[PDB]
Amino acid sequence: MISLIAALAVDRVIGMENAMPWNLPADLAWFKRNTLDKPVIMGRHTWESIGRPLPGRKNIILSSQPGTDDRVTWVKSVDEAIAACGDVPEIMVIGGGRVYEQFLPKAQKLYLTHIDAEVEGDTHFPDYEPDDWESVFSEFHDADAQNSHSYCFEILERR
Numbered sequence: 001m002i003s004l005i006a007a008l009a010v011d012r013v014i015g016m017e018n019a020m021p022w023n024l025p026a027d028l029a030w031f032k033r034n035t036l037d038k039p040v041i042m043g044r045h046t047w048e049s050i051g052r053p054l055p056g057r058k059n060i061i062l063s064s065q066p067g068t069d070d071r072v073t074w075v076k077s078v079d080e081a082i083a084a085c086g087d088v089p090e091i092m093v094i095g096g097g098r099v100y101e102q103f104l105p106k107a108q109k110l111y112l113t114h115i116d117a118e119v120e121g122d123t124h125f126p127d128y129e130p131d132d133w134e135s136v137f138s139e140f141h142d143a144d145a146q147n148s149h150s151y152c153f154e155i156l157e158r159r
């Protein structure tokens with residue numbers, strides 16, 4: 001099964017030109033916990049912003065162009081990406097906007113982090129109808145000395 005994982009502010013904003021104005025180490029501990037030892041699919045843009053291959057994960061990058069990094073796998077379409085994952089119990093899709101949009105319709109589960117922040121952004125997570133998903137897990141956290149804003153982790157299963 002395919003799952004999507006993303007952090008979103010109000011308005012489904014997931015990214016902007018510059019770094020986001022927040023610091024959420026807890027969210028990043030969650031992301032890692034949920035993606036480790038699984039293959040992750042991402043768009044060329046997300047990859048550049050990450051910078052290096054995520055450790056302990058099979059990295060598959062989607063690009064219309066030839067790959068410029070032999071440490072990861074480059075594919076040219078959605079179908080190839082899926083096949084590059086092989087026979088695994090769960091494929092994690094990490095972004096960005098374009099990529100989430102293409103995989104949404106094919107995903108069975110969403111691992112979302114709702115951040116209580118209002119920011120200007122230019123990339124949104126795709127609109128989803130809640131009634132189509134069952135919240136199987138949900139846990140709110142207040143901001144703290146380490147996390148600049150409050151947030152809530154939620155796991156959704158496609159009904």
Ligand SMILES: Nc1nc(=O)c2nc(CNc3ccc(C(=O)N[C@@H](CCC(=O)O)C(=O)O)cc3)cnc2[nH]1
Pocket residue numbers: 005006007027028029030031032046049050054055094095112113
């Ligand atoms: N929940 C969630 N949070 C995010 O920040 C997010 N980011 C992406 C794409 N951008 C990124 C950027 C950096 C790292 C990153 O450095 N990850 C290290 C974290 C080390 C730590 O725990 O700080 C990792 O190994 O996963 C991951 C994804 C995709 N889904 C998301 N989903």
Ligand SMILES: Nc1ncnc2c1ncn2[C@@H]1O[C@H](COP(=O)(O)OP(=O)(O)O)[C@@H](O)[C@H]1OP(=O)(O)O
Pocket residue numbers: 015042043044045046047062063064065075076077078095096097098099100102123
């Ligand atoms: N179906 C697809 N086939 C090939 N490349 C694709 C793709 N969907 C997305 N991409 C790539 O993934 C990049 C988009 O990355 P992203 O989804 O991380 O970015 P954004 O968050 O800005 O929408 C696309 O620009 C394209 O890479 P190239 O610009 O190198 O062509």
